[model samples]
Target: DTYKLILNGKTLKGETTTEAXDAATAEKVFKQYANDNGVDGEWTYDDATKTFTVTE
Candidate 1:
């Protein structure tokens, strides 16, 4: 698994400060941003699509 940041419906291009291959870790990072920055977001995993969606 990889971490990603989405800005204005577009995924931002860059590396994460921390790396992990688990969805939980990715969710934690996104949750932190939502809580601290007052942003509404969610993270989802799609086995068929083989991708993750992190929305805000």
Candidate 2:
């Protein structure tokens, strides 16, 4: 599974300043925030577009 950000139903493609190589890395970052804030969900990634989607 991978993670990514979507805009207009498409993945936001570009270089990230967070040292993330892909959506999965971004998802891990998001997960840290989620855990710190007591949020819960499963994150997955789209390889074709390098995006992340959250699932409950």
Candidate 3:
């Protein structure tokens, strides 16, 4: 179970930051959000390395 999402803090497992994707499902949400919304305070995910990335 990986941790992802930035819509919250110490909760929702989130932030405009990276960890480390840590999980599978978590990576999907952010990745889709970024792919759909590309850069503009957006985010992206890496399933291959399980690395989650974002910017705000």
Candidate 4:
């Protein structure tokens, strides 16, 4: 299963995919891109949907 990182209800695409096969791994990958790109926000993982929602 692929996990997704959501920022303001949109999917991010750039340095990284902002998506991964694992939730924990995706968080690291997503945060790396968000951090370097100045996207400061809190993360909320929805186990039911396997998606992480970012709120700034």
Candidate 5:
């Protein structure tokens, strides 16, 4: 239903939330967020919640 990116306990750039129907779309949005914000980290996705966590 919804997808978002989290970094350092907060939403990276404060604007990574997206409406994604599936994991593929969510991953695409996460990659875009990382690319746009120049974020470098390992990513972990939670299918249960559709939340993407970035560890730097």
Candidate 6:
């Protein structure tokens, strides 16, 4: 399965159709959404699971 970010039950796909994504790429996926939607939270990535958590 490709990487995914967890945000209040909402999930966003990774940068591409790959199973793992690096922090740099994940950061790219993160920035625009939070700003464009004006959402507030912390974005943290776990390399082991290749998952991102958006915490309030």
lDDT: worst 10-residue window of model 3: 8-17
Of the candidates shown, which would achieve the greatest lDDT relative to the real structure? 5
Model 5 gets an lDDT of 0.71
lDDT of 1 at 13: 30
lDDT for model 2 comes to 0.51
* Clash list (residue pairs), candidate 5: none
lDDT of 1 by residue, 1-49 (tens): 4555543334443223335677567667766754565555456655453
Give lDDT tens digits, candidate 2, residues 1-56. 33444322123223222346655567778666555544455656676866655444
Q: Considering TM-score, which of the candidate structures 1 and 2 is the better prediction for this target?
A: 2
How does model 4 fare in lDDT? 0.69
Model 5 lDDT per residue over 1-56, tens place: 87877764244544367787687887777777787777766888877777887766
Q: How close to the true structure is residue 28 of candidate 4, measured as C-alpha lDDT? A: 87
C-alpha TM-scores of all predictions? 0.44, 0.45, 0.34, 0.67, 0.70, 0.54
Best-to-worst order by lDDT is 5, 4, 6, 1, 2, 3
**Residue 33 in candidate 4, Cα distance off native in Å:** 1.5
lDDT of 5 at 9: 27
Report how far residue 50 has shifted in candidate 1, in Å.
7.9
Among residues 3 or more apart in sequence or in different chains, the pairs in candidate 1 whose N, CA or C atoms overlap within 3 Å are none
In candidate 2, residue 27 scores what lDDT?
Answer: 71
Q: In model 4, how many backbone clashes occur? A: 0
When 2 and 4 are scored with TM-score, the better candidate is 4
Compose the digit string of candidate 6's lDDT tens values, residues 1-56.
46666664244323322343366675566655555555556778776877666665
